[PDB]
């Protein structure tokens, strides 16, 4: 009942005993594995009791005075109000834990270094925007990026939810044409149409930074222009391909996910944007080279004078590698934090070893940890992994429409 | 029924075939173990009944007299003998289905084109060797490779198994060295030691073809040398890096797995080697670049004058791509069938489409289907997949020693 886990590069063997704590059942059954799928009232107390227990064991204070006291308070709070408020230190600990528990995140070696902004006293989309602006400016830090999350008020019954409508704080417009197809980012055609619907003046470019749609409880969303000085972007050039700059490509400094639901101790935060720094394959391989994204691969290959007439020239692979080189070179020249997929996966292996000793294993989603180029060149390819759900957690949630 | 999405196009299908999945895999609702490399006459009767049903469906005779006669026949034979014998046409159908059903095979567009050699009358290790030699000759076909399987006698009560001890018919020796290292292929250290212990006089090159260790029922394994002119090989050169040829690298034409068990309608064929042709990443990325295999990546990168002191130069990715180019160029120059990972994954997408129409789905293991370099440049990266076990099947089995 404790899965054996082997690293095939070295031959080492561990057992994941932490898996025995998995709460939310995943999508797989003994008869079929669905691991490759992107998307698969007094019980609030069991999750609260559990999470409070997590907190006190973490500080070596299980079964000691303040532990018991805190247990009664949440019990009394739920009895009196049907919910409870997290202590500040508990909110901090829970945010770090939800990051630590994210099976798809290869950057979790950093999970202990996370700046948590407490926005639980927020009210109105105007307050949200100032909070989001504080976060962006702190996280960006003139290109010396710092992991951060801003936690807006939790969900309560009978009253609407705080929501950010954009999937990220920086996104880039996607405009249909005289022919359906898209100029800009095809991943954001929908929110680009929602923004224009609510009064935004669309640009014409391929890299127009979208406005924010911020939603206070039970109000229509409100458009907000982001201060252009606050959105740090990187023009893309290549160290030796002089023409690469003339392609006019750019990407933004801060990856800040703004549509996921943060769940701690049974409480739900549908507005809790978190940010870190990019792994270069996210920009260079997925965002720029996915066929349903900017799809630039063949354009770069023509410029490199590659033989695109036959797949066996590996022109796709060569063009992709140089795009990733340009992402890394450009961010480093701009002094904007970035990590290549070799360094990131080596650090994740160290993370796995740390978590083995600390908690007896680590929930990891192989298909998302292995980078989208040069998979088997990285050590995580040869590492068997066990995927399961622990709480606190970041969860996906429906769009607010 | 699981909903399956393609994220490049937006397509959506439902895998109704997974509901008929017989045997059980390693995952539960609590934890996914999809990344793990290694995951009574009444029950023999029900397996056989299901396969006969499959066979008579394929020839448009479900529910016919001949169908019922065969069901009745197999029951009578199991009652009188504890087992039964496949008809020749049933064996051919069953070998093909086992390939069709293999979730980790990207080459399955080819599944209907498989030459089946019926060696179920084989009597000894010496005759086994002759059958194997003629398989290699037919399948190699002077470089115009043809898919084939040779089926040796089934497991049966009262007698030991036929077994091929070698994992493939063509393997390079791996010699433990004087300073702990391995000369040759480190994957083959164990089988190399067994060959020496069984009378083989070892070489000391990096590409010494191993002899075959062939086991007849209730016999010790017997050593057979492959005639050197039966084993077609490809010296590796690069189309523009002329020093590459001085590495002295080679690989063989014929990938022929010889240690898997073929299961058809409850009957087990522990010796049934099958062969196809290579996908270039198997050789260029895994066999030559894995740290625990030939491990040539850094040596190639240094010769390429790449900066190997920093990961962000992507020296590993650049060297790997040119090693794969060399493999593709070398096999094409030698007129030896080979398929690149772009062509192969494109043909697998057609296979999934064919199989959705034919059977309502297709068992597929995403982590094995996605190639080990350039994953998201291929269409299969963006295809959700359902992994499950159908019979007839190829199964792993313990080593005979
Ligand atoms: C500090 C540098 C970080 C790096 C380099 C990094 C890297 C990554 C990468 C490459 C992914 C893959 C997801 C995809 O490709 O769509 C990912 C996913 C994820 N990250 Fe991290 N990350 C970082 C920080 C953070 C932080 C600070 C948080 C939260 C506090 C976080 C939470 C998550 C979650 C929940 C996912 C799952 C994505 C999904 O399911 O769509 N990450 N990360
Ligand atoms: C004709 C060209 C073929 C191509 C291009 C091809 C390709 C592949 C590749 C790339 C793999 C993954 C190998 C690995 O990394 O371990 C694989 C696995 C597999 N192939 Fe195919 N193959 C071909 C023919 C065949 C044939 C003829 C059979 C059987 C009749 C077969 C049965 C299998 C099985 C059972 C596996 C999975 C075994 C495992 O998990 O290690 N293949 N194939
Ligand atoms: C599931 C389907 N898609 C959305 C349509 C997922 C896209 C997505 C959704 C996330 F929540 C998410 F965190 C990511 C990772 C991006 C990222 C985040 C951080 C903090 C650092 C970093 N380097 N990278 C991607
Ligand atoms: C996980 C266990 N290991 C060995 C112990 C893998 C064994 C194994 C089992 C296969 F079926 C398999 F196809 C391979 C790749 C070789 C190959 C074979 C064919 C027919 C075509 C092709 N292109 N390549 C390796
Ligand atoms: C179908 C497949 O699961 C899907 O394309 C996944 C695969 N792995 C991934 N891995 C990361 N990091 N990000 C992704 O978007 C995906 N997409
Ligand atoms: C641990 C992981 O499952 C293992 O390294 C797998 C991943 N995917 C693979 N895919 C193929 N085709 N061949 C392999 O050997 C592997 N190895
Ligand atoms: Cl992104
Ligand atoms: Cl091989
Ligand atoms: Gd030119
Ligand atoms: Gd040259
Ligand atoms: Gd040398
Ligand atoms: Zn699974």
PDB file of N, CA and C in Angstrom, chain A residues 172-176 180 182 185-194:
ATOM      1  N   UNK A 172      -1.825  39.687 -23.169  1.00  0.00           N
ATOM      2  CA  UNK A 172      -1.728  39.927 -24.617  1.00  0.00           C
ATOM      3  C   UNK A 172      -3.007  39.598 -25.389  1.00  0.00           C
ATOM      4  N   UNK A 173      -3.463  40.557 -26.197  1.00  0.00           N
ATOM      5  CA  UNK A 173      -4.738  40.456 -26.897  1.00  0.00           C
ATOM      6  C   UNK A 173      -4.712  39.428 -28.031  1.00  0.00           C
ATOM      7  N   UNK A 174      -5.890  38.885 -28.338  1.00  0.00           N
ATOM      8  CA  UNK A 174      -6.077  38.059 -29.513  1.00  0.00           C
ATOM      9  C   UNK A 174      -7.271  38.522 -30.324  1.00  0.00           C
ATOM     10  N   UNK A 175      -7.028  39.082 -31.506  1.00  0.00           N
ATOM     11  CA  UNK A 175      -8.068  39.704 -32.318  1.00  0.00           C
ATOM     12  C   UNK A 175      -8.393  38.829 -33.521  1.00  0.00           C
ATOM     13  N   UNK A 176      -9.680  38.563 -33.739  1.00  0.00           N
ATOM     14  CA  UNK A 176     -10.104  37.916 -34.973  1.00  0.00           C
ATOM     15  C   UNK A 176      -9.831  38.827 -36.174  1.00  0.00           C
ATOM     16  N   UNK A 180     -11.785  35.276 -39.446  1.00  0.00           N
ATOM     17  CA  UNK A 180     -11.812  34.461 -38.242  1.00  0.00           C
ATOM     18  C   UNK A 180     -10.496  34.325 -37.495  1.00  0.00           C
ATOM     19  N   UNK A 182      -6.577  34.795 -36.020  1.00  0.00           N
ATOM     20  CA  UNK A 182      -6.224  35.666 -34.902  1.00  0.00           C
ATOM     21  C   UNK A 182      -4.899  36.371 -35.159  1.00  0.00           C
ATOM     22  N   UNK A 185      -2.415  36.709 -29.471  1.00  0.00           N
ATOM     23  CA  UNK A 185      -2.361  35.426 -28.783  1.00  0.00           C
ATOM     24  C   UNK A 185      -3.696  34.712 -28.919  1.00  0.00           C
ATOM     25  N   UNK A 186      -3.760  33.560 -29.602  1.00  0.00           N
ATOM     26  CA  UNK A 186      -5.040  32.837 -29.716  1.00  0.00           C
ATOM     27  C   UNK A 186      -5.563  32.277 -28.403  1.00  0.00           C
ATOM     28  N   UNK A 187      -4.721  32.112 -27.385  1.00  0.00           N
ATOM     29  CA  UNK A 187      -5.213  31.636 -26.096  1.00  0.00           C
ATOM     30  C   UNK A 187      -6.133  32.643 -25.413  1.00  0.00           C
ATOM     31  N   UNK A 188      -6.066  33.919 -25.792  1.00  0.00           N
ATOM     32  CA  UNK A 188      -6.802  34.967 -25.094  1.00  0.00           C
ATOM     33  C   UNK A 188      -7.842  35.644 -25.979  1.00  0.00           C
ATOM     34  N   UNK A 189      -8.274  34.978 -27.053  1.00  0.00           N
ATOM     35  CA  UNK A 189      -9.294  35.547 -27.931  1.00  0.00           C
ATOM     36  C   UNK A 189     -10.582  35.801 -27.156  1.00  0.00           C
ATOM     37  N   UNK A 190     -10.913  34.897 -26.232  1.00  0.00           N
ATOM     38  CA  UNK A 190     -12.143  35.007 -25.455  1.00  0.00           C
ATOM     39  C   UNK A 190     -12.120  36.217 -24.525  1.00  0.00           C
ATOM     40  N   UNK A 191     -11.083  36.335 -23.692  1.00  0.00           N
ATOM     41  CA  UNK A 191     -11.040  37.465 -22.768  1.00  0.00           C
ATOM     42  C   UNK A 191     -10.822  38.765 -23.533  1.00  0.00           C
ATOM     43  N   UNK A 192     -10.156  38.704 -24.691  1.00  0.00           N
ATOM     44  CA  UNK A 192     -10.057  39.883 -25.546  1.00  0.00           C
ATOM     45  C   UNK A 192     -11.434  40.325 -26.029  1.00  0.00           C
ATOM     46  N   UNK A 193     -12.323  39.370 -26.321  1.00  0.00           N
ATOM     47  CA  UNK A 193     -13.676  39.741 -26.728  1.00  0.00           C
ATOM     48  C   UNK A 193     -14.511  40.224 -25.545  1.00  0.00           C
ATOM     49  N   UNK A 194     -14.267  39.693 -24.342  1.00  0.00           N
ATOM     50  CA  UNK A 194     -14.970  40.189 -23.162  1.00  0.00           C
ATOM     51  C   UNK A 194     -14.498  41.590 -22.791  1.00  0.00           C
TER      52      UNK A 194
END
